[PDB]
Structures are given as C-alpha cells and as structure tokens.
Design an enzyme around this catalytic site. Sequence first.
Site, mmCIF file in Angstrom:
data_model
loop_
_atom_site.group_PDB
_atom_site.id
_atom_site.type_symbol
_atom_site.label_atom_id
_atom_site.label_comp_id
_atom_site.label_asym_id
_atom_site.label_seq_id
_atom_site.Cartn_x
_atom_site.Cartn_y
_atom_site.Cartn_z
ATOM 1 N N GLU A 118 23.029 40.511 48.612
ATOM 2 C CA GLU A 118 21.586 40.727 48.796
ATOM 3 C C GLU A 118 20.898 39.621 49.640
ATOM 4 O O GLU A 118 19.868 39.896 50.263
ATOM 5 C CB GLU A 118 20.869 40.810 47.438
ATOM 6 C CG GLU A 118 21.232 42.026 46.588
ATOM 7 C CD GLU A 118 20.817 43.405 47.083
ATOM 8 O OE1 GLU A 118 20.078 43.500 48.090
ATOM 9 O OE2 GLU A 118 21.218 44.398 46.434
ATOM 10 N N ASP A 127 11.393 46.241 54.830
ATOM 11 C CA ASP A 127 12.738 46.668 55.228
ATOM 12 C C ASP A 127 12.687 48.097 55.836
ATOM 13 O O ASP A 127 11.660 48.778 55.738
ATOM 14 C CB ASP A 127 13.701 46.604 54.016
ATOM 15 C CG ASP A 127 15.198 46.529 54.339
ATOM 16 O OD1 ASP A 127 15.556 46.551 55.541
ATOM 17 O OD2 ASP A 127 16.001 46.371 53.395
#
Length: 423
Positions: A118, A127
């Site tokens: 991550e 994102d």
Amino acid sequence: SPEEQLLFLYIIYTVGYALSFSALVIASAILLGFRHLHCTRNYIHLNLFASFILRALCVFFKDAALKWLSYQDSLACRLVFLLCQYCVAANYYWLLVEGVYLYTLLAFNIFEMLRIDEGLRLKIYKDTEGYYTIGIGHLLTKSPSLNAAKSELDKAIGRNTNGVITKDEAEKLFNQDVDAAVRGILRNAKLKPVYDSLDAVRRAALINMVFQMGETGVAGFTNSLRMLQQKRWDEAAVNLAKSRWYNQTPNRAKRVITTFRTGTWDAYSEQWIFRLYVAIGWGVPLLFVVPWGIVKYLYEDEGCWTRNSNMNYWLIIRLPILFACIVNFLIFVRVICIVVSKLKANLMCKTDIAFRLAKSTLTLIPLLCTHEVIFAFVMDRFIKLFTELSFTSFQGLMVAILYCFVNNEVQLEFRKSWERWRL
Ligand SMILES: CC1(C)CC([C@@H](Nc2ccc(-n3cnc(C(F)(F)F)c3)nc2)c2ccc(C(=O)NCCC(=O)O)cc2)C1
Ligand SMILES: CCCCCCCC/C=C\CCCCCCCC(=O)OC[C@H](O)CO
Ligand SMILES: CCCCCCCC/C=C/CCCCCCCC(=O)O
C-alpha cells in the site's frame, strides 16, 4: 583396557559420521526432490547440510589415507585438515544465518506486508478510482470534494487536518483499518471458516485482499476460497490468476497468491538478502581459516598442524567461532522473548512454521555452541571428556532429523506422493 577403550571410541565416531552422512544426503535429496519444499528456509538448510556432508568427507578421507613417509608428514593431510577446519567454521556461520533468518521471520507480519504493497502518503491524494486516500492505504470517500474529504478525515483523526498527516497518525489509522479488516472477515459467513483454517502466513494473505478490495468483495471468490479450505494451494494459485483482481493489480496479486501457494514471505523478500547469507556461511569462514592455514604452514608446520600449542595462532580460528556462538546465544534468548510473547497474545499457534522452526533452531544453537562458550579460552576423566567425539560425529544426524525428517511439510509431501500412486 587401554587399547579396547581407544578402539570402541573409534567405532561410535565413525558410525556417527556414517549415520550423519547418509541421513544428510537423504535429507538434502528430500528438500531438492519435492518441488513444494523449494523455499528460502529450506535453501538455508541445504547449505548447512552441505557443510556437515563435506566435514564427513574429510573424516572418511583421513581414515582412508591411514591405509598406506608417514601421513602426518604429507602435505595432503594438511589440506584435508584445512578443508575440515573450513567446514567446521561454515557449520557455525550457517547456524548464524539460521538464527538471523528465524529472528527476521518473527519480525515480518501483515503490518509489514501491507506497508510494502500500500505504501505511505503524507498528504491527501485523489486516486484513479475517484477515492481520496492517505496514510497506509486508508481510503476515505469517493465524493469528488477535497474540502469534504479533509473534513471526513478530520473526524477520523481528531484534530484539524489542513492536508498533511504525520507518520504516527497514519500508523494509528493503519492499525484501525487492519482491525476493521479482520473484524469483517470474522463477520462474514464465507470468509470466517477459510480464515480459521489458514495458518498465520496465509491468514495475512487473506487480510491483505480484504484491505485492498473489501469484506463483501473477496467473499465473491467462492471458487478459490473452497480449495484454500481444502488445503489445495497449487490449484487455488492458478484459479486466483484467472481473476479481475490479478489483471487489475498484477504485481500485488502475484505476491499475495505466492504467499497462499507456499505459506512463506518469499514474495516480499529481497533477492540480495539470500546472497548475504551465502557470504556469511561460506565467505566469512574463508576470511579466518586461510590466515590460520598460512601461519600454521609457515610458522608451526609439525604433524598436520596437530601441535597447536605455541602462540596466538590458536585464537585466530577459536575467536571467530566464539563470536558466532555469543551472537547465536543473544538470538536464542531474544527469539524465546518474542515466541513466548506471540503465543500469550494469541498472535501465534504452535502449529505455525515460525514456532516449529524455532523449536529446531533453539535446540541446535545450545547443542553446537554451549561447549565453545564454556571452554572459551582453554587450549588443552580422559574417558569422560572423549564423549565429545560422540556428539561431534552425530551432529549431522541431529541437523537432518530436526530440519527434515520431523518437519511437518516433508511428511505432507510423502503422504501426498503416496496418495497419487494409488489415485
Ligand atoms: C533433540 C530433542 C529431544 C530436543 C528437541 C526438541 N526441542 C525443543 C522442544 C520445544 C521447544 N520449545 C517449546 N516452546 C518453546 C518456547 F519457549 F516457546 F520458545 C520452545 N524448544 C525446543 C524438539 C522437538 C520437536 C521438534 C520438531 O517437531 N521439529 C520439526 C519442525 C520443523 O523443523 O519445521 C524439534 C525439536 C528434540
Ligand atoms: C536429488 C539430489 C540428491 C543428491 C544428494 C545431494 C548431495 C549433497 C551435496 C550438495 C547439495 C546441497 C547444496 C546445494 C543447495 C544449495 C543451493 C544454493 O546455493 O542456493 C539456493 C537456491 O538455488 C537459490 O534460489
Ligand atoms: C555431488 C552430488 C550432486 C549434488 C548436486 C549439486 C548441488 C547443486 C544443487 C542443485 C541440485 C540439483 C537438483 C535440482 C534442484 C534445483 C531446483 C531448480 O532450481 O531447478
């Protein structure tokens, strides 16, 4: 009788190396033979077996040279003895990487697995999917509003965000998300039975999917989840590749699928780390065995250098093996503090690789390094001390037993192969 005592001790020594050589050749053939046993843990064992196998070869060659200037005056004996002393140093430095590996195996967990996959964000980021994320994979809301995303994070942190969140606040929110991931699995009818059947390593692989996708998302893999619960790892490995998850994020999925297939952390291990272990096990012995060999040939050359009682030339081959034993006992003590902590906190069961590997490694460290620490600076009841010859000969047999024949994974492979013979 004096002659009978010297002959009987020769038999238990030579049968000790005969039983150790054969057992280590058989054990190393088992780890190489079965494809599922090809992991960094067993590769470390194969180099350790090789150092005990070559030591045995020196003992059989010295004995075979007794039959037909005497052998003590020959140069061939001095080389066989120099090679033997290289194998002894390799035994203790491959036992050091065996301890160093175990210690790092106890240190790696789901929190270190996810920090790699991550990553870490200091500031709020929008994102590709439209979700605002920050910290270690902490998704907020898909709502296209940075002003509301900062406020959504403000209630989820305590104080005002402004945008920048510290490394400690991100780790605080990370523990929340991992706790929210495990509560979701155990609150799911199709994920609780497969999670409870999985080992700690393959459990972290299941949590990792839930962290990225979600509880209801990974519950859809009905086809993969069933063959995981049936311990069919290789069949689940090729089925998880035929997923939307594998084609969307392939570099992350390949690592998680390997962890399900092998039950190890090798897909998260760096390739240079194993090259550093081979530099310790076979490299460091060479750095103190050859200076010893050169000084004995030039300044104490008398009967295959068996008269090792004159100067500091004894210490240059006894101080580095004492250093490998002092650090191996420091690991021994620290590994016990970690193992008893993880068992009491229910972070580990005794059926897991890290406990069973600790159960063999913590046995071999005081088995090979206690004599070296007790008689640390002693250069040189004679029948009772000659019982050292029995333990140094059977050392290899014990290593082969504790790291192969009583290993649960190898016993699975023999039964799995015998079942294929019938079916
Ligand atoms: C020579 C002997 C009589 C001694 C040996 C024995 N030694 C042993 C036994 C238990 C603990 N122990 C318990 N709890 C803690 C604590 F405190 F939590 F750390 C340590 N420590 C040491 C042993 C038995 C069983 C195995 C074993 O099955 N191996 C296979 C596992 C593998 O290779 O994958 C290995 C060693 C056998
Ligand atoms: C089927 C085989 C039966 C024959 C009996 C064996 C004889 C024992 C001697 C040497 C083998 C052990 C040493 C070789 C293993 C170490 C490999 C290595 O150096 O690196 C690890 C790996 O290859 C990187 O991914
Ligand atoms: C002297 C006896 C011969 C022992 C073999 C030499 C040791 C080198 C290691 C390789 C063993 C060969 C078996 C193949 C297993 C490796 C798996 C692979 O990567 O293909």
